[PDB]
Paper text:
For a precise comparison, the crystal structure of ligand-free PPARγ LBD under the same condition with butyrolactone I-bound PPARγ LBD was also determined at 2.1 Å resolution. Both the structures were determined in the same monoclinic space group C2 with nearly identical unit cell parameters and were similar to each other with RMSD of 0.53 Å over 513 equivalent Cα atoms. Compared to the ligand-free PPARγ LBD structure, binding of butyrolactone I to PPARγ LBD induced conformational changes of Ser342 and Glu343 on the β-sheet in that they formed hydrogen bonds with the oxygen atom of benzyl group in butyrolactone I and Arg288 of PPARγ LBD, respectively. In particular, Arg288 was observed in the alternative conformation, forming a hydrogen bond with Glu343.
The nuclear receptor PPARγ is a pivotal transcription factor regulating mammalian adipogenesis and adipocyte functions. The protein kinase CDK5 can phosphorylate the serine (Ser) 245 residue of PPARγ. The phosphorylated PPARγ at Ser245 is associated with the down-regulation of insulin-sensitizing adiponectin production. Butyrolactone I functions as a PPARγ partial agonist.
Numbering used by the authors:
A (entry chain B): 207 to 241, 245 to 270, 275 to 474
B (entry chain A): 205 to 264, 274 to 477
Amino acid sequence: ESADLRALAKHLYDSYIKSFPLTKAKARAILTGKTSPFVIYDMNSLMMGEDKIKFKHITPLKEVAIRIFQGCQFRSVEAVQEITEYAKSIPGFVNLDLNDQVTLLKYGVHEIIYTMLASLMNKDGVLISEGQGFMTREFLKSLRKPFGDFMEPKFEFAVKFNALELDDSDLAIFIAVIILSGDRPGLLNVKPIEDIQDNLLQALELQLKLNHPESSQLFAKLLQKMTDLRQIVTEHVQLLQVIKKTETDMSLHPLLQEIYK
Amino acid sequence: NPESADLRALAKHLYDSYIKSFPLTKAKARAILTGKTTDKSPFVIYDMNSLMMGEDKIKFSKEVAIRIFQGCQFRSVEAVQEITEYAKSIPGFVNLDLNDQVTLLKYGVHEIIYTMLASLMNKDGVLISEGQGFMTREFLKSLRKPFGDFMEPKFEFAVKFNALELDDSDLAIFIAVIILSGDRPGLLNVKPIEDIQDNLLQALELQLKLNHPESSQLFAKLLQKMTDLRQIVTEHVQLLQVIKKTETDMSLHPLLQEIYKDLY
């Protein structure tokens, strides 16, 4: 039965490598610099960034702050398809009621986005467009209200999350645990969701004990980060509402709005 | 073999996403139309009195032709939203230039709507209100001009298209092929779209061979139907230009207005 959890851990790792092109391992090599990304530290470097590197997130289709915000949304929609593909590789997931599969992804993708975004962040900035770019924390903070404090909470979360020093093999199982949450609203058959998560939690616990034997109660500490993630998502939703209500320059092509709803 | 295996995985992925995106499948539509059951029986609207009773029996301007026309607008906007949700699930679609995403949906959505409207149709009429209702082909043709001419060419297409006997698993890949069309006016990067469609076309070819082994050149026959769809759009566009001018008191939903703005 111990061999079964190690097999599940390996399976999830291999699937995570297939689904997510920019791994934490690769992201960290770039951030520390064991290899070079184009740095966006102000408006002039942003302009040169667009011009030279052609970020599909920033492509013209207007105020810089809004074009950065909309770039974040375009990337978020990309990430949802990578996560959806990963979810299908989790043993039991495809066998669930199809409405429940949709429900788990609907409520799970935000938590997963901010988990995996930590992998691309240090205290100084964030890797963008598959590690070709590095946007500074200070530059994001300098954006006019309310866009100035849109990324800052993610940075504060990331710095603390990154202190757990998890690797891709740890994260693969943690992300699977997040997807198989039996407390999501509107679920029809909670039992086989909790049975799969119970199995993933067992796999995650062995993985952290074998991978991080010196790291006392790392399992407990990682599960506590669920609190930090759900608060980040609740907080982010509350910022979207403020934006939709008080900003008059957010409008895109109506089909564009539908895609990136 | 490994090549085949990847195309079956893609087929399975697209069918799963199709069931998740489209609440009323062909399988459910046929079960309602073939009227075998006691629980799935639709209320049938064939005249003005039947329509007026339908208003109560089913859960949804004054003039009858207009109420139907604007009801059809609301549903068409809802279908656009479902098709947009489906498009995002097509591997590679959300990774394309954002302008090309908008362009592919702009030209793709109505071709898909008419393809999928075939599923809700037999030679005698069309399912409405998530299959709770059935509106007869005769009632729709009897409507004051030019409103009587909107649905007839859709029915004509549907009776021919339905003779191919496609199921939802076939249709999931076919509508994917329609969206990823490299020949849409004003596409910026044609190559990556063609590369996705080539893989989708390989997936469709295998799907039809395995699912319809006795159906000779079904692949070729299905691809030729994309000619009929383009044709339905052209006629529809011309018919809307007439309404715009004759009914100055009537409003076209902004999303549809945008889709048709500078179309061809």
